Motif scaffolding. Structure first.
Motif, PDB file in Angstrom:
ATOM      1  N   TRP A  10      -2.095   5.183 -37.332  1.00  0.00           N
ATOM      2  CA  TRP A  10      -2.670   4.017 -36.770  1.00  0.00           C
ATOM      3  C   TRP A  10      -2.947   2.865 -37.952  1.00  0.00           C
ATOM      4  N   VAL A  13       0.098   0.952 -38.089  1.00  0.00           N
ATOM      5  CA  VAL A  13       0.331   0.281 -36.692  1.00  0.00           C
ATOM      6  C   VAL A  13      -0.334  -0.831 -36.546  1.00  0.00           C
ATOM      7  N   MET A  14      -1.805  -0.665 -36.805  1.00  0.00           N
ATOM      8  CA  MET A  14      -2.671  -2.011 -36.696  1.00  0.00           C
ATOM      9  C   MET A  14      -2.492  -2.955 -37.741  1.00  0.00           C
ATOM     10  N   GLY A  16       0.303  -4.000 -38.904  1.00  0.00           N
ATOM     11  CA  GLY A  16       1.446  -4.535 -38.547  1.00  0.00           C
ATOM     12  C   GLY A  16       0.780  -5.396 -37.231  1.00  0.00           C
ATOM     13  N   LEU A  17       0.198  -4.789 -36.216  1.00  0.00           N
ATOM     14  CA  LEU A  17      -0.194  -5.460 -35.077  1.00  0.00           C
ATOM     15  C   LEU A  17      -0.857  -6.811 -35.450  1.00  0.00           C
ATOM     16  N   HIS A  18      -1.863  -6.855 -36.398  1.00  0.00           N
ATOM     17  CA  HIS A  18      -2.522  -8.076 -36.891  1.00  0.00           C
ATOM     18  C   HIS A  18      -2.016  -8.715 -38.245  1.00  0.00           C
ATOM     19  N   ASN A  19      -0.972  -8.259 -38.678  1.00  0.00           N
ATOM     20  CA  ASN A  19      -0.186  -8.834 -39.547  1.00  0.00           C
ATOM     21  C   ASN A  19      -1.436  -8.927 -40.765  1.00  0.00           C
ATOM     22  N   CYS A  34      -7.027 -10.504 -42.739  1.00  0.00           N
ATOM     23  CA  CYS A  34      -5.941 -11.557 -43.203  1.00  0.00           C
ATOM     24  C   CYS A  34      -6.793 -12.471 -43.822  1.00  0.00           C
TER      25      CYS A  34
END
Lengths: 119, 119, 119
Positions: A10, A13-14, A16-19, A34
């Motif tokens: 996770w 994954v997350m 990447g999801l949120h960059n 970020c």
């Protein structure tokens, strides 16, 4: 199956999801950071029946409280979903301090965790 | 390690999570679309310290604004988490126009991106 | 490509994300449950252009209403994002009763689904 997801898949994954370039977590929350302009933003999820308190002053990044907090909201409680710092960067090893709460009861517990570079 | 998650594995995961048939994204947001009846719904996430403004008049799918937006909210800001159209369908190649915002510096920036078929 | 995510990989990822021991889903929602103290908390996502109603009385776990519901909000509409029980545990086979809604056409439909052990 000859191949498996790691238990912390996770995080990958997350991030990447949120960059996101940094993240931080405990058994009770996670946040994906970020950097942008002079500050940073975290997208926040609860874990283990807990969530992060939205009360101003309950959260600190490198001793500084966030300037804005967005939340999911209810009649008696609200949980952080996004929080920002106008002038504080995310960086490896800095401490996020928080109050964690649970909708199950009226408890409030101090926690802290250190930011880690995104995988 | 022999095997690795692609950098866009989040696309696969989140399309599955919402049972989405189309998605759209930039460095600054992503949205996962489901078609139903005469319209569609997107489940929306921020990326890269940004998020989508909840000003429906500033969002257009194939030149049409959503009539519903649900959001995470705070004192002066709010971010789209779900948006819907009554009469506009999601399809590959159609344009989503939007306003992206960041809590860090209160930036508001126009953007546009094309919908793509879910993997 | 020699290796591929299962179509239900989002179950593994989201259970990891929230540190959940049980989950439940239909074509129209999913919910990831954690047990703590004497009750449980579910982190909730909409699927297939639907979401879970926040209306009191609309949700039962093992015949008990939740004590708290947090939501994403807009106008008078709202969708469950987190929900809790003071005194009810998540466990395999127990029934979640709910009302599913869609912003597209204001559908509102009852449903129920059984909890499953996390993978």
């Amino acid at each position: 199956n000859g191949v498996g997801l790691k238990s912390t898949a996770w995080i990958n994954v997350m991030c990447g999801l949120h960059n996101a370039t940094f993240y931080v977590y405990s058994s009770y929350f996670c946040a994906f950071f970020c950097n942008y302009s002079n500050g940073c933003v975290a997208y926040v999820y609860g874990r283990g029946a807990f969530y992060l308190s939205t009360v101003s002053g309950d959260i600190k990044l490198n001793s500084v409280s966030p300037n804005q907090i967005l939340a999911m909201t209810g009649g008696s409680s609200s949980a952080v979903t996004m929080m920002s710092w106008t002038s504080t960067k995310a960086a490896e090893g800095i401490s996020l301090e928080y109050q964690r709460k649970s909708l199950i009861n009226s408890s409030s517990i101090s926690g802290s965790a250190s930011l880690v570079s995104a995988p």
